[PDB]
Amino acid sequence: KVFQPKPEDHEKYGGDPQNPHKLHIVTRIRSTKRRPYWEKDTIKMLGLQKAHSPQIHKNIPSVNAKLKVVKHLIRIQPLKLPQGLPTEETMSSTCLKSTGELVVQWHLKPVE
Amino acid sequence: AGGQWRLQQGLAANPSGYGPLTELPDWSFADGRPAPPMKG
Amino acid sequence: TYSSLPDDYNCQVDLALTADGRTIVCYHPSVDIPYEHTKPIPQPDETHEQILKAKLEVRKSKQLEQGPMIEQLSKVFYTTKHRWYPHGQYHNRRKKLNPPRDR
Amino acid sequence: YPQGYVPKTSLSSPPWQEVVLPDPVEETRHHAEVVKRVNELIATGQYGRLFAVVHFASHQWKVTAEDLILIENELDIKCGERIRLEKVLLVGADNFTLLGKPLLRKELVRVEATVIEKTESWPKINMKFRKRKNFRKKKIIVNPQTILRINTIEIAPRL
Amino acid sequence: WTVVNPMGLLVEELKKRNISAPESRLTRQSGSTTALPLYFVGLYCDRKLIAEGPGETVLVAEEEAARVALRKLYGFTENRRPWDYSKPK
Amino acid sequence: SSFSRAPQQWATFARMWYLLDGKMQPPGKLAVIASNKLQGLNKPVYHQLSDCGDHVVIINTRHIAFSGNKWEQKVYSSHTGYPGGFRQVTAAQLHRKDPVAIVKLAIYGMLPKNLHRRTMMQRLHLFPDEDIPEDILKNLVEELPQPRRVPKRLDEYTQEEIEAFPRVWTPPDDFRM
Amino acid sequence: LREVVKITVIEGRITETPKATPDPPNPSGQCPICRWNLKHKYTYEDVLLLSQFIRPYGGMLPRRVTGLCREEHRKIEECVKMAHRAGLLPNHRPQLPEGCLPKDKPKLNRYLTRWAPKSVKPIYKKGHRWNKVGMAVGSPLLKDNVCYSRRPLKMMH
Amino acid sequence: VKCTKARRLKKRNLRTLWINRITAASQEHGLKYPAFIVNLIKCQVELNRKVLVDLAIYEPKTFKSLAALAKRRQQEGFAAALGDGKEPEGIFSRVVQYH
Amino acid sequence: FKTKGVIKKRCKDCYKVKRRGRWFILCKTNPKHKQRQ
């Protein structure tokens, strides 16, 4: 029941129950120390060794099951692509915002 | 100081994150020749 | 008068944003003290050495003993006697002969 | 008494005093006037010395002409080559200052420096706090260093 | 450059500039009666502050205040435009 | 600034005299202000090794006020160093015997627990009432705002101000009052 | 106001009384305090407000005559005691029966005094930091008053 | 060992020294330390705690400009919260964006 | 003036008072009923 969303929940987080996002941005916010051995393994299986380092993962049921076990130790933010997926040409100009948007052009200039 | 505000603006909570302050080159040559890219 | 800080003690603050809004421009001229506010110098009564002698007047017993003398010094400078007491020959020789100088 | 009126009492009003900011329209004219005055000051050589808070390496440096600074790493520069610093968060004079948000434009400020000398740090002792410390479990950390002189800070009337 | 009569020289310079003799006044005062007094003495011309000076005593503050003014006139204030050693020519 | 080096050094590190009035002021708030000035924490050049403290003069220590029942509940303790030499005296009794002690103790308590505290305490000058010696008055360079706003007494209020405050209720004419 | 004049013949004569200010900001306020929108905005230092409910010699007026609701009949009474103990009502001193002089001891300045100074014993054993005993400041009855601070007021010091 | 455990304690004490002197500096102009630092950042001006102490000690006039600027943004922030709805924010309140 | 945890009236004439920080019941008819907390 915890993972069954409510209509008010969608409004607060601004996520549609349909057209779900594909990729999770997962970061480790707390320590694995003092946690049961099984929780330690899941973190290393998911690659969340260094805290405050975002990792890209699939939003699929198998990944979700592991992500739920370490639900309390991480922050999940849906990846967003305002300008679309990066291409070969723009792969070297990518930059991830704190908002969760992977822009394909990084100029370091005023937006104007 | 003031880290939550930087997130609302869409910036990096730490000023030493993604931004012109860090990523831009620290120096150039007097002639204007660009310096070798910083290792970081 | 647009400044939020009174412009009467240190300087006058004028704050403005450039047209683009990418540079903040500040004009801070220095305010001199008003002539009226100043006090006339009292000429009728001088080197600091003379002032020390007047404060540390030798009136009784010629050179006072350390206990009395040091107490007199402590009053003048608002310090304790312990500061004025000497040190031995171990501590004296530890001191650097020529300490480094920056400007 | 009008509806919502609270008789004057200690807890009626907040301790702080509400402030009324100037109307935006007139402020812009004043702001434009302030910028014009400062630009003329720069244009007609009405400054003396200048300081700049240059963000170099990972450290912000308050610098001025004829200054020396120490950089705790190699810089790939030969001895004597003059350098230009591309990040300056503040430039000031006796009577005016210009603040970047967060950096000034290249045209406004050009900071030139020279690589005086390249060296390494004096031996530094690292000895971790651990049982059985011993006198020999000690390593001499030594780092490379470069010394820079801030030759000239120049400004232009492009406000 | 060693000058022992700054106040006397200041009067001479002001006359050369067609400026009246300065008036010395006590701008600030700190712990005068104590053995560590600080006084700020500022020379005033036509009720305008030409310069200010700090001193242990009024005479030293007055004498130093002359030193500040002479620099002003000669433009040796430390905040002067730095010498241009870097001119290619 | 163009000042000479020695006068500049003398000016920067000079020491100031500050006057504080304790009438209807709690000693703690006086202690907070007084202790800060004594250490030199108000100076941007403050350094623990620089001995940059400044003189503070506090007057009207006899007229301080305490919140709540702190007069009869706050107790100061001392020991003479001999058996049975333990004395616990309430604030009211200490203030009656020595008006200046209560203010002095608060400043002593807040100051850092090191050897420099004793040197700082010399700089503190406390007078029970507004009387000040002639030399100190000359020394004074500035005064500091009282931390606690003193509520006005009913008699102090002007007649017009009383009129300004509306009458919440009126007793009936058939009342002794 | 009816007052007795003695001459023996003694006569009580009704005299005109000051009238309350009309047009309260809050119409139909059940309790006089709320009528004037001062429900939770008055404190002990508000001498002008409190004085309107006090007998000439400092005693409290009966609830009926004042009209205040019990909730504001106790809070107002509590604030009055704090004002008297703080010397904010110098003109409402007790009536001296036979010209008796005051105690003549100097008055210690006090404010926000919850209890009578005579009835409070000293706390000789202060207690340690964790177990430290607290000294009362203010009264709990004023909990609901508006607070302009980041965190709630500390009643126990 | 003490020399090694003190190489990483002069970087924390030297910062606490700066906070003492910045707290002293702002207090002269009437601002608490939290207000001074937070507002300066909210104006998008990034100056670390090491230069701010240098500015106060050696450039007192410039620090007054920073104190006034920090104070104005604090006032603007108070006005925005006090005045709800769609209103143009203060001139300094406007935030530049980098893409 | 027996010091007891609970003060209870022993007669109709008994009344309650709060003197010097404690609760007292004093009875005019019978001094026996006088108590303290």
Ligand code: FES
């Ligand atoms: S104040 Fe309104 S019910 Fe009493």
Ligand SMILES: [Zn+2]
């Ligand atoms: Zn009975």
